[PDB]
Design a protein around this ligand. Structure first.
Ligand code: CA
Ligand code: CL
Length: 122
């Protein structure tokens, strides 16, 4: 963690929720050591979602419920190694009306999530 890691910048994180609370769509732009404003997106991802690949890249993500904020992101980067980079962070969102009952919950400030080759802290 302190020495071998990758800073992932998340921007424009956006989630559309139905009146249901079901996730209709999730969208964000990822920047890292090998990405600049890479689109990560999913329609009907589930909560928690499966691991989803960003475009054609070696970056992937999963969406889950946070503990401080509503949404948490898990991020993955395949390195061509037997181990990969992984990390999780919560993203503050402000929710607005999305039309016909929907919510659109939107990140207000870019945030950084650190990923590395260690698993989750206990
Ligand atoms: Ca990690
Ligand atoms: Cl971790």
């Amino acid at each position: 963690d302190p020495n071998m890691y990758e800073n992932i910048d998340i921007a424009d994180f956006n989630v559309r929720k139905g009146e249901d609370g079901t996730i209709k769509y999730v969208n964000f732009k990822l920047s890292g050591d090998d990405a600049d404003g890479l689109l990560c997106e999913a329609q009907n991802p589930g909560l928690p979602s499966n691991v989803i690949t960003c475009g054609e890249s070696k970056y992937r993500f999963a969406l889950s419920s946070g503990k401080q904020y509503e949404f948490a992101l898990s991020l993955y980067h395949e390195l061509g190694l037997a181990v990969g980079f992984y990390g999780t962070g919560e993203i503050f969102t402000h929710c607005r009306a999305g039309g016909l009952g929907d919510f659109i919950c939107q990140q207000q400030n870019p945030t950084t999530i650190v990923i590395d080759s260690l698993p989750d802290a206990p």
